[PDB]
């Protein structure tokens, strides 16, 4: 199926406590394969998946230099954006960046993306056409004019629909034993009385990969959009994911409720009833 490669960057200014903390992570689909932490001891881009370790020293020298230049670039931008928004030098602020590309099962380019944030809010983003920018406020428009004049979109596009796709294809080939598997969800239901007259029906889904999933509780055809507790999808720590959803039903009416599970590794939507 489709695949993605995405890089995530976080720069947090430490006012009067040293240079800003910089953490970078590379993903193929939902599998981390590289990382960099400014507070770690190696001060180099480090492997985090088995299939990336075969890359040679010239690969790890290049990724180390590039990830450090991204860190230095964020240092400037932390001070620059602090001036755009008329903020004091005393506060801690955050710049977050994400970019990457998607390919199909045939390896063809599907889309590229780049989005930047400041203090957890949209700052500037590249449009899907990979040619124009969208700034979130008038301060970020200053950056947009600076990047339009420098023709940053053209150079970034050459990576997003070119080099990014090239390496993603190589990674998918080098890790074809671990990156091209979809595990279907193991499902089960539990029943927990909260009193003599009401009970909590909880619908479970375990060991599914990728993380995308949908759990909905129905009651006599109608869907309980509310009256339904749904937790966020969570990692198991082994490559798979978990999620549950629960509803409080009257005791003796459990047979009128149905849970529905939708995953890509399932040939049909699973329907469960207590």
């Amino acid at each position: 199926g489709s695949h993605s490669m995405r890089y995530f960057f976080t720069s947090v200014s430490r006012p009067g406590r040293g240079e800003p903390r910089f953490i970078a992570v590379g993903y193929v689909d939902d599998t981390q394969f590289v990382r960099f932490d400014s507070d770690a001891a190696s001060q180099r881009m480090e492997p985090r998946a088995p299939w990336i370790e075969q890359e040679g020293p010239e690969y790890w020298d290049q990724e180390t230099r590039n990830v450090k230049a991204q860190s230095q670039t964020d240092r400037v931008d932390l001070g620059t954006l602090r001036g755009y928004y008329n903020q004091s030098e005393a506060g801690s602020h955050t710049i977050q960046i994400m970019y990457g590309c998607d390919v199909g099962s045939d390896g063809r380019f599907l889309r590229g993306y780049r989005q930047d944030a400041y203090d957890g809010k949209d700052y500037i983003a590249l449009n899907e056409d990979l040619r124009s920018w969208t700034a979130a406020d008038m301060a970020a428009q200053i950056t947009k004019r600076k990047w339009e004049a420098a023709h940053e979109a053209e150079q970034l596009r050459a990576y997003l629909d070119g080099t990014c796709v090239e390496w993603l294809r190589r990674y998918l080939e080098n890790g074809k034993e671990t990156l091209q598997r979809t595990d279907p969800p193991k499902t089960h239901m539990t029943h927990h009385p909260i009193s003599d007259h009401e009970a909590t029906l909880r619908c479970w889904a375990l060991g599914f990969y990728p993380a995308e999933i949908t759990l909905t509780w129905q009651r006599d055809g109608e869907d309980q959009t509310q009256d339904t507790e749904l937790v966020e999808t969570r990692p198991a720590g082994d490559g798979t994911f978990q999620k549950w959803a629960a509803v409080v039903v009257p005791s003796g009416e459990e047979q009128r409720y149905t849970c529905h599970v939708q995953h890509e590794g399932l040939p049909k939507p699973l329907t469960l009833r207590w």
């Binding site: 890089y7 991204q70 670039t73 950056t143 600076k146 150079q155």
Partner: peptide, 9 residues
Amino acid sequence: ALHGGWTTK
């Protein structure tokens, strides 16, 4: 692999 182009904001 990582992109190697940085224009300041």
